[PDB]
Design a protein around this ligand. Structure first.
Ligand SMILES: O=C(O)CCCCCC(=O)O
Length: 245
């Protein structure tokens, strides 16, 4: 009944891969191996550095539902991004703060973690630079997740499970207005915008095949210092359990 946070990072020289898991002890070997195997064979390359790490969690665990999901079919990245910018505005980010974020996204391609963007300053809020803010201690039991996929008619890919767990944890934070995300994997072009009102909005094309610039940005409207928020994001333990209605 004690849970452990289990984290993996892998890189070349370029970031490669990562994983966050939240598990009971008896699943340690299976989890550590799954994270290992995940790091070794990624399409961004085989890594020359990897770290795997576990710690007992002392905070109590909150179980939540996943964000509601809707999938937007688009014909091209440019259409995808336009729709994304529209949905961020719909969720409450001002056009002008959106534009400033997009001016910076190319420079964030190297950040190994999430970027926090303050809607009050129109500027990046966190001071982690290339490290990025790390969202952790969230997970989604597979069996529950596969039932969710079957009902939702969405493919039971672990990377959707991971992304929707992160997005659901993150959107629950009262200071987070929206998240904008697409992959750094050259072979996966689907991304999303996520928010409290629109839920998890998948957008089937957010970049071209073969490009490696991805993005993850949280738009922050809060009254607290950024370190508090960084601490919430790292420390609040979250499990996703879906229940049909
Ligand atoms: O909703 C999806 O299809 C998952 C998109 C998230 C991509 C993040 C990644 O795997 O790099």
């Amino acid at each position: 009944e004690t849970f452990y946070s289990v984290r993996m990072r892998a890189s070349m020289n370029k970031h490669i891969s990562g994983g966050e898991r939240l598990i009971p002890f008896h699943e340690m070997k299976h989890t550590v191996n799954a994270l290992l195997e995940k790091g070794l064979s990624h399409s961004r390359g085989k890594p020359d550095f990897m770290q795997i790490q576990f710690e007992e969690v002392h905070e109590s665990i909150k179980t939540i539902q996943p964000l509601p999901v809707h999938t937007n079919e688009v014909s091209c990245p440019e259409e995808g991004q336009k729709l994304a910018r529209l949905l961020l505005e719909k969720e409450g980010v001002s056009r002008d703060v959106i534009e400033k974020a997009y001016e910076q996204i190319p420079e964030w391609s190297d950040v190994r973690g999430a970027v926090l963007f303050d809607i009050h300053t129109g500027k990046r809020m966190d001071q982690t630079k290339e490290k990025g803010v790390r969202v952790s201690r969230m997970d989604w039991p597979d069996a529950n997740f596969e039932k969710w996929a079957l009902h939702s008619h969405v493919p039971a890919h672990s990377r959707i499970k991971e992304a929707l767990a992160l997005a659901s944890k993150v959107s629950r934070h009262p200071a987070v207005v929206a998240e904008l995300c697409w992959s750094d994997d050259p072979d996966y072009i689907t991304g999303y915008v996520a928010g409290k009102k629109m839920g998890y909005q998948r957008i089937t094309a957010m970049k071209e095949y073969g490009t490696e610039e991805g993005c993850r940005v949280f738009f922050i409207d809060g009254s607290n210092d950024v370190n508090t928020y960084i601490h919430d994001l790292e420390k609040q333990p979250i499990l996703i359990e879906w229940e049909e209605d």
